[PDB]
Amino acid sequence: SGFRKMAFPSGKVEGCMVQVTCGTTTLNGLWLDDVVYCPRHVICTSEDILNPNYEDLLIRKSNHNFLVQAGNVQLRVIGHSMQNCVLKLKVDTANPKTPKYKFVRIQPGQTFSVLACYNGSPSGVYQCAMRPNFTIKGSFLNGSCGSVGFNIDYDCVSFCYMHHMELPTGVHAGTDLEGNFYGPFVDRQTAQAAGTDTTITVNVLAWLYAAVINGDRWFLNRFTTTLNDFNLVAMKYNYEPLTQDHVDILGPLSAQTGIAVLDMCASLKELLQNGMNGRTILGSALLEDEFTPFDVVRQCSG
Amino acid sequence: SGFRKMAFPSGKVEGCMVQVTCGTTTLNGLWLDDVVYCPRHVICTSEDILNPNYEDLLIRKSNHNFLVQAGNVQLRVIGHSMQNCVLKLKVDTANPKTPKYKFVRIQPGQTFSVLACYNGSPSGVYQCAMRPNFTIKGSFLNGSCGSVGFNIDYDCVSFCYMHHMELPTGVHAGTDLEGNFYGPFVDRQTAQAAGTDTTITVNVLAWLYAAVINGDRWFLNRFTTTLNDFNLVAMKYNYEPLTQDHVDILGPLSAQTGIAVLDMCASLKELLQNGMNGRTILGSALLEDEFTPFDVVRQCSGVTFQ
Ligand SMILES: Cn1cnc(Cn2c(=O)nc(Nc3cc4cn(C)nc4cc3Cl)n(Cc3cc(F)c(F)cc3F)c2=O)n1
Ligand SMILES: Cn1cnc(Cn2c(=O)nc(Nc3cc4cn(C)nc4cc3Cl)n(Cc3cc(F)c(F)cc3F)c2=O)n1
Known part of the structure; x- marks a missing residue:
């Protein structure tokens, strides 16, 4: 649990x-x-x-x-x-500690771990999401450049982020390991600002499914919704629109919980109009959006 | 930042x-x-x-x-x-990857990292706080027993926790590396319930400092209080008492930010009574008690661990 x-x-x-x-x-x-x-x-x-x-x-x-x-x-x-x-x-020397690795470019909403490093000495590790506006809400001090973000899968390390700069808003911008920036940013000290951020809706739904698996019970409802009615409401709360692709991704969680995706969407919809009235979900009183549907399956029971 | x-x-x-x-x-x-x-x-x-x-x-x-x-x-x-x-x-074989290490026992409110493993294979790492009721709020599935909690000081790994069991309330219980349980538990299949938990007050103030350092300043007031007056209010709201040792520990954060602890306690005192009025601190809608004062200094001063 x-x-x-x-x-x-x-x-x-x-x-x-x-x-x-x-x-x-x-x-x-x-x-x-x-x-x-x-x-x-x-x-x-x-x-x-x-x-x-x-x-x-x-x-x-x-x-x-x-x-x-x-x-x-x-x-x-x-x-x-x-x-x-x-x-x-x-x-002139290959690193004998090199692991099985690859370079992957990730999409907004995908999560990864970041190894914060200063003078080449690791200092700490934490979890991140690629925001819909192509920034990450990192923890980085000066000299953290070159710190990488990664995932690990059967002792294979997919490298998907290298840290370059901090934006005026306090968030951070970087590239994949082929040097292409995530987002409309450039490695220059010119005027640069990130887009207005939005919540990764598919991740919140995944988290809500994780709450039910762990037995949380207070936010769901007898209502269902159309994909378009949900997206209409969500966008009014700075939430990312949901596509049929996202609905497909949640399929397994829906199957495991016996709660259809559009039923849960109706539960997110109500949650967005009422709040949580002092209550929490999995210990959080805000809706968490840095757990993907993959992460939710990996860490949760079966 | x-x-x-x-x-x-x-x-x-x-x-x-x-x-x-x-x-x-x-x-x-x-x-x-x-x-x-x-x-x-x-x-x-x-x-x-x-x-x-x-x-x-x-x-x-x-x-x-x-x-x-x-x-x-x-x-x-x-x-x-x-x-x-x-x-x-x-x-018969010594571990050639054996790090410079020691066994320590930690106090409630102190933090540590946990390397959750399954079948000896490390799967994920996360940062815990020993709760006042001597449980930890972990994420473990079956196979996790023997997962260890540690801190790193320079090149020294300090093992402080070993996982043993989950309590029926969902929280977790284990021992230090010498087998002594943390809290009033036994390694037996019986009905065991976690004591009522409380908020690590000194960790909340340390977190409020981290918020100020990041320019999140709305909760700062103008008032100051005293340890007595604060602790009287803190007991009511299930908050841990703030001792004189706790104040000295928040010394460097205080001097780095210009916000004297006790002035900060006035802010936390208000937050405890009035709530956050639909605002957030470091994006969070609750007061965070899993960051120690040293944690905050470490994370806001770039100290590495080789
Ligand atoms: C607060 N923060 C969080 N993340 C970052 C990333 N970051 C960084 O680590 N260093 C930068 N400038 C340097 C100055 C140096 C002075 N000396 C002696 N050595 C230095 C090395 C660096 Cl790397 N910057 C600024 C920055 C870096 C860029 F890559 C860029 F394109 C524009 C920029 F303004 C930085 O953002 N800082
Ligand atoms: C979901 N969850 C997360 N943490 C825990 C704690 N915990 C555990 O991980 N495993 C336990 N029993 C085992 C059965 C096995 C079957 N096989 C093939 N291998 C097994 C390994 C274990 Cl470790 N238990 C049970 C348990 C173990 C104790 F030592 C105790 F004092 C009370 C208990 F209820 C467990 O709690 N579960």
Whole structure:
């Protein structure tokens, strides 16, 4: 029983974190095989941040401008290339701690664990969701760049996020491991603002199914709804519209609980018009949206 | 900026998790040097667990009954003994991934990370607080026994918790690494209920500081109070008393933010009576009591753990 926001064990990723220094800039790098991945803005200087010409600054660089440190062992950069917004440094030793891994681009609503790192030393691990506006509500201090977000599946580590910047609103923006940003953001110090955020409706429904599995009983109702009537109400509360794809994803949870998806949608609808009247669901008095339908199945009973 | 529930990087502990099997019972073990630690209830049958004599159950068992699985390599038990509610299995090989470690016992309100495992395979990590009633609000499914709770200081892993059982109310109970239970529980199949829990007050104030550091400042008032006046109100609302030691611990947060604790207690005092009036603090609609003052300083000052 119980229900906690749970992160993945971070050991496989801890063995890959290194320190990348270029000039005075020091951030974290992800060391897989004989390549260290890190945000390309590490080659920028105080002046080259508002409008950096990264191709010009990199063709500009020699391998011995980069200092890579795995613990007290300085790796030797033997080559450096750029792929979109990630820098790739070839090093002369493959990381013997490299796990089975792949690079995956995730979609808004998907969750992942983030290993916060400073000077290449892991500091803590937590759970995140890719917001519908392509930001993440992280916990990051200066020097956290290069920290990665991941999932683990049968000792295979899917890397799906690398941290680059903090936006004015306090949220954070990053890329996948191929250097493509999530969202309309760029690795520049120019004026940048994220879209208005919305609640991941499919995740809340999943969480509500998790409450019933754990026996929570107070929010459901005798009502059902049409997909369009629900979406009409939800959008008026800054909730993401729900598509038939989402309804399909919830299928297994609905099957396990004997509560149809559109029945539960009617329960979310009522919850949005009444509130929760002092009560809580799985210990929360707000609706949680950082549990996917996959997560709910993994952590909950059967 | 930002603020999250954060656990210690679990890697040092992951290299110590093994699967222990006794008969049909199978749970997790902690492999440190040439000893494997796990709950003693593994030697129990579905009826001996109702009322056992762990003494006699143990001595009757032999070494080859304990299947100690380290991933897939099998470990050879060359001895076994008890220490309170934790069983100890001596194996022929010392764990080469053994971290710099010690066994500590924590107080209520102190936090730790938990590495939930199943069949010796680490599955997820999360951050707990020992509740005042000596339970922890965990997320465990069957197979989780032997999952361990720890803290990391520099390169030292401090093991402080081992999971044993879930209570009928859903919360969880276990021992320190020396077998001593946390709270008034026994490792037996009987009717056991959790005592009435309370709010870790010093952790709520520490969380309010984290909110201020993140610029969430609406709850700050203008008033100040006294420990007496606060604690009189706090007892009514099932809040833990705030001691003089608690105030000194909030010292650095106080000086970093310009908000003297007791001034902060006035804010928490108001929040306790008037509620939050449809507002939120760090996005949460409840007062968060699972962040210690050191937790807050650690997370807002970037301290790493190698
Ligand atoms: C508060 N916060 C939360 N996450 C972040 C991420 N982040 C960061 O870690 N560092 C940044 N600037 C640097 C300055 C340096 C000074 N020295 C000596 N070394 C430095 C290294 C960095 Cl990496 N930034 C700012 C930033 C980073 C970018 F990648 C970008 F495109 C624009 C930016 F304004 C930062 O956001 N900070
Ligand atoms: C859902 N949940 C989450 N945490 C818990 C605690 N807990 C547990 O995890 N396992 C238990 N019995 C086992 C049966 C097994 C059958 N096989 C094949 N392997 C098994 C392993 C275990 Cl560990 N129990 C029961 C239990 C064990 C005790 F030590 C005790 F004092 C009281 C109890 F009710 C359990 O509570 N469940």
